Amino acid sequence: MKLYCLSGHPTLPCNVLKFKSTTIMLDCGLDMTSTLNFLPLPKECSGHVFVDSVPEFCLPETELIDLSTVDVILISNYHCMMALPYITEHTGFTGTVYATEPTVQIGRLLMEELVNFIERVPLWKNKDIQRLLPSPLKDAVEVSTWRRCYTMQEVNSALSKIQLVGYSQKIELFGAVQVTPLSSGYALGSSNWIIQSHYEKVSYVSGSSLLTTHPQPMDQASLKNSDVLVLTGLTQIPTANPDGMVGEFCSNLALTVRNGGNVLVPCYPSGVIYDLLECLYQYIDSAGLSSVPLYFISPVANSSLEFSQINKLKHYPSIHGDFSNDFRQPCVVFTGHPSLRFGDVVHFMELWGKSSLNTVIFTEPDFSYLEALAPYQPLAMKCIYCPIDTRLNFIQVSKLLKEVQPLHVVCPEQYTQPPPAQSHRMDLMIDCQPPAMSYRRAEVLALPFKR
Amino acid sequence: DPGDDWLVESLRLYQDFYAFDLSGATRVLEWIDDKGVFVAGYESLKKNEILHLKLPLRLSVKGLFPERDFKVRHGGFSDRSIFDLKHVPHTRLLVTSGLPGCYLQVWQVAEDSDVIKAVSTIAVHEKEESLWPRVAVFSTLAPGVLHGARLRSLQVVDLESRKTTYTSDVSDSEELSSLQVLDADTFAFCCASGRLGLVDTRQKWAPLENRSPGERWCAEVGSWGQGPGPSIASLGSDGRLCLLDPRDLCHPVSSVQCPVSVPSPDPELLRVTWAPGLKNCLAISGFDGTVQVYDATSWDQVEPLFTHRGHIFLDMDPAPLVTTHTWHPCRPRTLLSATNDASLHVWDWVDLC
């Protein structure tokens, strides 16, 4: 019945549904965008106030509802679990957490990569000191509930408690409140959820897709009959078509390589990189471009590719080692943490960031490349933006809302109004009948459909 | 894969070879003429599509024809599993029978369409329907159905006026295993125990029979109007074949054992035929995925002059047996064999000797 919203970021939610007795949690998410404010891990960065300290991560709200009394914590995909250590350790939570197999495997990979990038590498958060600090340091929000980086022990202790669930299985609880996950074609093993009961069935979509069918496609059918449809994770960019942006990616890559420079690609070790590499292989075989080495450099590459299974791409654990032997020129180096706050990508940038034949190519729809790049200027390396977001646009949202049509719909604040930049494109909003309801951080919502 | 190896063997063995894959398993063959053949499924739980199929243009050349495959000439449906069929000379009328049904259907072939209509039924006093009767037509001035399941049921009735013209009226309760129209004055049969018999019609039932002193003996009489030459073949479920003479039927002529790989599991799928184009050449079939052909006069356990095994390689699974074989009345050495796994092959063999 009741609903607390312990985070506001659209792609990385945290939704606490509260029934009569059961209290389910959804998608414990980490907001790494705050990390964009600090310095790299090798002041007035181009005129912006940056807190040179250890990188930090914004934890969601916790004070709103006691985090021990929560009952169950589901998980939709790997992007929405990087904040699991804190929530399962620092407060005394005791319940269980369900997920899928590839979800937990890839979450393991990403957690290990992050703790490696924080461990291998060995003052302004006050109220008035920030409200007087230069922008966009003061532009931050809720600078009190932040937390430092977790440790590997917490990673393993959290992976201890996660229970694997196959596709479309069914689970019960104390009350007769069944729950069930259904694939949603987003990633290798995404899952929207259903929380059915005696008389108050609820659905919960989170970041689905209708493009390439090699994963298990979205089951838009099994979501009918719903009564209250919580919805999250639409596209992060308003207007683009992933095929166009993949064409742009390949075109810029081939333009830079054929010129005589090098190409840098920040990206997660697992995730978008599968789509990127499949389309780039298609290109290499399509436009005849070859005889270039694709070095992939991530300390978690081996398990990543072995799981992509269950000789062009050369995967390494780091740079110090076999790299200074095979490192030809040109090259296409997929590496780094995409936020450019920590990792070998800092070394690669500082090495290449002075010439004008090289090129960085952003592909992450989450991290805004402008501020993420600002601490490096002056930069003679031609930067580019090329988001690849295969999530639900608004047309497909309206179409699926028609094809299901539940009683109500609950959404974040940013979905009942056009984006703040484009207010004239008044199609980008949830035009569902009847009109939907909204919330924000720490908003106590209540849809009393008690009948 | 053994297939290509068997194909390179066939390159030397056969002359022509066509391997069609029918819709349903057939167990009945009879030419309307040398331009087409009749078939009919025998499955029990579903309908059965009697089909009339045009022979490939290549086989009956006397140019170089574009097509080399069966064409569907006429279709028809039924609900009973057909187990026998014939053709009346000069007519478009097929008398049939099958399980179940205590009545011989009579189908008329259409003219301006590709369908087949059931036009009449022949009613029988058949109380025991677990044994299906034999059927046959006559090549007479008046089309004479001759049929029956038991000797007392062997009767001659005409086509139209249902007038039962002749019957054995014997007392026996025996269910024979073979019947044959020989000529417009006499015919023959063989019991399910080996009791052959040459019977006449212009007089009362006059059984001239060789006595058999429960493996079923399927029989067939050879060429009529030739003179000498023992021309009665009959084979049992043990691989025991026997040839006897028409004019002195009491004394056996050539009783031997064909070197079959196994005594047939069901003697209901056993068959023997004669070569209507050559002399004393006889074919046997029904024990395994093969078919055998011998010559007789060179015996006075022998070797098989020709063995065909096509149904074992192209299609390992439970034994696919030849459910029926059939000669061709014009081409000297072509056979047509139908298998229980929805296949039908038409093949000639090299004149090795």
Binding site: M245, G247, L255, H424 | -
Partner: protein, 710 residues
Amino acid sequence: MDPECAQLLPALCAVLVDPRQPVADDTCLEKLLDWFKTVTEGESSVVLLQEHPCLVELLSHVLKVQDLSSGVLSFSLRLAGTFAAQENCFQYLQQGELLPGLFGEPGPLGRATWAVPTVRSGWIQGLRSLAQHPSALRFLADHGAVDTIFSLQGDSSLFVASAASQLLVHVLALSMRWPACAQKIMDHVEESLCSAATPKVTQALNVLTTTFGRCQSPWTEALWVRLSPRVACLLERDPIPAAHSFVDLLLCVARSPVFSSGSLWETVARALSCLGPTHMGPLALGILKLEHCPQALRTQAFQVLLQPLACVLKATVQDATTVDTLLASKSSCAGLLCRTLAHLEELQPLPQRPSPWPQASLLGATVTVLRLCDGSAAPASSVGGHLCGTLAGCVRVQRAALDFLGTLSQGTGPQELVTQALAVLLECLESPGSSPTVLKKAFQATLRWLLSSPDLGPLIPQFLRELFPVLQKRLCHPCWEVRDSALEFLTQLSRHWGGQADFRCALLASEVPQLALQLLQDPESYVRASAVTAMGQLSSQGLHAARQSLFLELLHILSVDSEGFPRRAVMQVFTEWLRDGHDTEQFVATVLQAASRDLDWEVRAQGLELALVFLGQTLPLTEALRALCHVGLFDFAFCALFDCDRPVAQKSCDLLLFLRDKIASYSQEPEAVLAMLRSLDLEGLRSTLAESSDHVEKSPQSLLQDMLAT
């Protein structure tokens, strides 16, 4: 006929009617009927039945065998038709009750063949084939056939229905030059025009459309005077009667000064006012394409044409049914805008277009719709925003607008327009989210806009240095369509602006040449061919990135390449270089040596053309022939002469003729080789080779031999 088919005609007449033969072909029967027309169109027809009195036996069989095939009845019927077209024959074919039988109930009309469309079509075609002289009108009237045609002009076989309507029109146009036949026809027509169904009024309007506009006798004038009330009253049903043959009838009546003798234009105005926003466009354009019209009418026509673009330009920072349609859905808006832009595109290059003709407002509307489709518009009301929505990422509107804005390029005007157009075209060239067809259209439009401005001006070099990065990003798109488009655009540009300082500076400054040079090894053959032509062109100007080591590259593509397109493109480039006057002996030698063993029919032809160019450049004839023999033209010529293809032998015969002309006009010793070139009858040779490749297989004698062989 001929002294050969006589020996075959009775055999054919016997094998056609036989029932047990194979069903005769269709190609053979149609070509047989074509030959029969070629025979019995130049001479009499009764002589052909007094000299070979066996075809009449077939025509008799048509109504005697009662079991022919649906597909030879048609042949014999159309044969009777094409024969019974002369008076003497039209009666020589009735002695025995044959023609009344052939088409009447004693024919296929009474059998169970009036269910297969081939027989209906043959019947109608035969009737139309005979009905030319008044005896045919007597037959068509008295015995009664016109009611059969009225029955067939409702059929479900568009071939049959259309042939029937054309037959009605031909019967009327024969008769009325009111007799009973034309009277009955027009009575039925004017009766049908009063029904409340679609097929009746549609067929009636089609008969009228084919009647008017086709024949211009004064009786058609009175016919229209009589029929105008019904047409003019059609425009009152709520579902207007099919609303398309209506527009076609109005627009076809209007194009005759004869019908200017004043109640039509009122109907045209009422139509422009009432017809729906799907046919109003075609009518408006067909009116505006007319020389003569009251100027108020053409004013309203141009107004109801421009309405949608004006409404679009209204509600974007820079009238009921149009705005309703635009806000209806995406399909309606896209169709309306596509149709309007296509209309305005066709209307322009005509000299009868309205004067004045807005060039600035139109250009602004096109640029605004193109920006709306892109996504960089600036709405100014709720309808503007919803339109920006319903046009976001459309493709048909973008194709249409690009083609339009490419057509508004020969209208000379101020530099502001050229700057606006090139700005929007460059913003459309560099956009992730541009399909390849949009990019091809935009390259064509940009080229046509660049080449139509008042040594390259004060504003171009900046645009060239803005363009070449985009043309560089396009030379690597993951779709060979766009690579080829950009390569041919570079070729067109560098051919029109080759000798200009600013263009060559801006080109050699950037990185286009080396990319084009690397594209000579792209997998897809079309991209390789286009890159080869582009490099040849860029080379003949002197814009490399010596040309010698380019030559070899191209030569290699000629020697060992899988496909054929690169080979003929290379040969074209070589012919170009040599005709240009741009070391020559070995050049021609190696090119003929690399072309004398190619398995195409185009490469050998281009090699012969190159030989012709070199010959022209040669002709002191002794040194000339010494060079022409060291290159080795004799081998190529005499080996391609007796070839297995027609075009190559033809071109070689042309070359040998040219050479013999010149060498005999000037006259080893050239005398012996001239005697050799005279030895073969190049005249009879070219006569044989200039033939069609079926001068032995199309011959109706071979057709008859074929049809009787089976």
